[PDB]
């Protein structure tokens, strides 16, 4: 827990008998990394670069390190878990060195015959058990299906992460015997963001569970109804579930009564027991709690973005360096694939594992410092440091 606690202590020293932030960070910090770094091959290299520092701990903790190798050594279990979760995530994204695996039977079937150069399509003969189906590999619309999955994955994981971080506030308020912070801050703050951005996640999961062709109804745009929930209330372009019109108005109206129920119940309980030190602080807490709901839930789209760009650079590096040498039968081509493999391996180990693994690690760090600990971590404290 020492490296994870050193990561959470760089932000702030916790309050006395507060919930520690370094205990959930053991799993969520290398797993938000894994979604941004979804490759079965690069995770193998990262586990192998992690186990050459774990299998000899005794030789290294009695020698001088020097400020980069020191951070590499004290964060070795972090790199171990990041590589293992990268293996799992890249197994689910179904790519190893920008190539697929083909280890089950597909849920798509091509036609019986065609002429060489016809835009055929597949016939959907079932579903694929674990991961993405390997029949989406070239297909000339792979980035059309493959990033509607990866955009909704990020919204669901960000929502579940923030709503798990937010119950730590209830668990703190129920320890320090602070029953006004439950009724003044927790309950309106819970009904605000679950009534707007949790409804969106229920709408994402429900739309996947409905067959919109066997039933004969048009599939609505979730983003379109999300915008028209606020900017044109009442109207519905395409009906998603049979009483959708009353629920939109009820959830819009509930999220607007939480603006006077926050910023007003907490100060007046001070007055009837306003002062300015409580009222203005609560106005700032309310117009900062709101406007961080939308900003914090939109900040999780970097999970989609860094994953898409990692996959795209790893696919372009394959087709520009090692793919060239596959058309060189002869004597010159044996030397050609040696040099081209050396260039491929050097660029996929330096550019693609190291300085994109460092980028993907510092965006998972931001999601813990900012989007997670702005809901339960109260801030300033006193470090221990004995004599």
């Amino acid at each position: 827990t020492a490296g994870f606690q050193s990561i959470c202590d760089c932000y702030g020293i916790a309050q006395y008998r507060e919930i520690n932030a370094g205990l959930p960070t053991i799993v969520t910090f290398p797993f938000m990394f894994a979604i941004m770094f979804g490759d079965m091959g690069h995770g193998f290299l990262m586990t192998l670069a992690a186990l050459s520092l774990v299998l000899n701990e005794k030789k290294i903790n009695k020698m001088k390190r020097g400020e980069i190798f020191d951070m590499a050594f004290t964060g070795r279990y972090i790199i171990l878990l990041m590589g293992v979760f990268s293996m799992y995530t890249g197994f689910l994204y179904n790519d190893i060195f920008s190539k697929t695996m083909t280890i089950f039977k597909s849920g798509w079937k091509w036609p019986d015959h065609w002429k060489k150069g016809e835009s055929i399509t597949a016939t959907s003969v079932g579903t694929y058990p674990i991961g993405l189906d390997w029949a989406w590999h070239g297909t000339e619309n792979a980035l059309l299906f493959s990033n509607s999955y990866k955009m909704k994955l990020s919204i669901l994981m960000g929502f579940i992460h923030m709503t798990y971080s937010y119950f730590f506030s209830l668990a703190n308020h129920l320890y320090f015997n602070s029953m006004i912070d439950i009724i003044g801050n927790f309950i309106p703050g819970l009904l605000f963001m679950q009534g707007i951005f949790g409804y969106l996640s229920v709408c994402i999961v429900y739309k996947w569970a409905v067959d919109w062709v066997k039933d004969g109804k048009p599939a609505p745009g979730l983003l379109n109804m999300l915008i028209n929930m606020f900017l044109s209330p009442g109207t519905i372009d395409d009906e998603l579930y049979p009483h959708q019109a009353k629920v939109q108005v009820f959830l819009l109206l509930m999220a607007l009564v939480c603006i006077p129920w926050l910023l007003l119940v907490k100060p007046l309980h001070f007055k009837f027991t306003d002062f300015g030190d409580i009222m203005i602080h609560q106005v700032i807490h309310t117009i900062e709690f709101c406007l961080n709901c939308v900003s914090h839930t939109a900040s999780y789209l970097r999970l989609w973005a860094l994953s898409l760009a990692h996959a795209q650079l790893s696919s372009v590096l394959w087709t520009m360096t090692i793919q060239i040498a596959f058309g060189f039968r002869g004597f010159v081509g044996v030397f050609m694939t040696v040099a081209l493999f050396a260039m491929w391996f050097a660029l996929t180990c330096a550019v693609l594992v190291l300085m994109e693994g460092t980028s993907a690690m510092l965006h998972s760090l931001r999601l813990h410092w900012v989007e997670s600990m702005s809901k339960f971590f109260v801030g300033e404290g006193l470090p221990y440091e004995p004599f």
Binding site: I227, S295, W369
Partner: protein
Amino acid sequence: FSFSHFLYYLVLIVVIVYGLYKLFTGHGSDINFGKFLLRTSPYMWANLGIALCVGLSVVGAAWGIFITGSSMIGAGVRAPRITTKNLISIIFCEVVAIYGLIIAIVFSSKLTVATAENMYSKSNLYTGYSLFWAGITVGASNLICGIAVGITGATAAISDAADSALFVKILVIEIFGSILGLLGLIVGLLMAGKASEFQ
């Protein structure tokens, strides 16, 4: 010598002499700005809107980031504990570009292929005009918002290095400065609300 001012004055002289020539000749309706707006392809306006939206939002984010970041590194030589405290000044500058991503995601769903006939119709020209000005509005508002929040973040970093009880009171101004980009987002999503795709 102000050579760019000389270029401006040459352009103004040529414009005035050309328009005055067309009036006195009798052909002043040959400079027809309305026929330019009907013969120009709507895909041009839509793609310039999308590209300038994301480009201008990213430029404003980067401007605000170096304005706050230079002062935050300079104020951390003597007070290195301001670094992780003032990171949200950079967070407010960088959500400016995520709004540009969101606008480019919404608007790119409307880039469908129209037919040869039924091309310069009322709905397609409307969609081009709406996407062009909506992209410009949210991109320019995000450029302005990013630069303003960057200036306030640099000033807040200086104030945090001075006295740590001041950063709570200068953070209020960054909250006021960040609503401007969200208003730009709302007006961008509302100007292109009734616009259909390119059927």
